[PDB]
Amino acid sequence: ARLVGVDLPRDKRMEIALTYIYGIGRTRSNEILAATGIDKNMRTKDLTDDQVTVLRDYIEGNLKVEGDLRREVQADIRRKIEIGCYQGLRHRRGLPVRGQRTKTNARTRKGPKRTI
Template identity: 65%
Template sequence: MARIAGVDLPRDKRIEIGLTYIYGVGFSRSQEILEKTGVDPNIRVKDLADADVIKLRETVEGDYLIEGDLRRQVNMNIKRLMDIGCYRGRRHRVGLPVRGQRTRTNSRTRRSGKRTIAGKKKPPRK
């Protein structure tokens, strides 16, 4: 079992896909990491040698901002926007879409619980 950055990689997937289970590593970054370490991208996670796992772990944890540190940085960026009171920060604070999407008909997930859904009937009171 390969464990990198505190994440257990799925055993039956190719390492190219398995690395994307780490927060902050997408497909293109996964390919970049494999090219840098010299590991074959078509090999399955369960077939990795221990030396390959160690090379991958050192590269991922040393060169990239991932998992907890990345989550912390993203949350601090959002908190900074909210503290300075800019438009995006106010949208985050109120729980509305931040990037200019329309809110009249869409954005159900972002506005969840704020408004009733049309056509949904309440059970009768007894």
Template identity: 65%
Template structure:
């Protein structure tokens, strides 16, 4: 089992895909890391030798902000926006889309499930 930055990488996937299981590493960054450490991107995670694992681990930990540090950094940025009262900060606080998307329809991910509204009561007749 290969463990990098506190994440267990899936054994049967290629290493270029396996690295994307680490928060903060996508496919592009994975390719850059593999090129810097000269590890074959087509090799499976279970077939890595100890030298490759240590090279990957040292490259990632020394040059990239990942996992807990990155989550903390993003949370601090959002908290800063909320604290100074920007438009984006208010949208974060209210749980609405932040980047200008429409909310009349769609936006279910941010707003949650639909809630039905009870029918309007009629005024009593005279």
């Protein structure tokens, strides 16, 4: 259902359903449920409005919203690219930032296997 802007699965447990958010996953949802006092074995078809609101405000207070995290990643990436460092150079060239193999690997970051 509508929690922060994303829809949850139809028939799935809570700890796996909360993974749809860009800032919550399996263990994060488990910790949130443990802190809020909600079970994790419940399906995604028996939720209450009060529980929805309490979880929403709890995540908004402890963590930040999915869009917040998205645009924060974007802003950090563009900032580290504009400062003009090694990370920025690698991001501009489409190469790994953590300094790993780049001879034949790094296709996950360079895109499909292109040959020219």
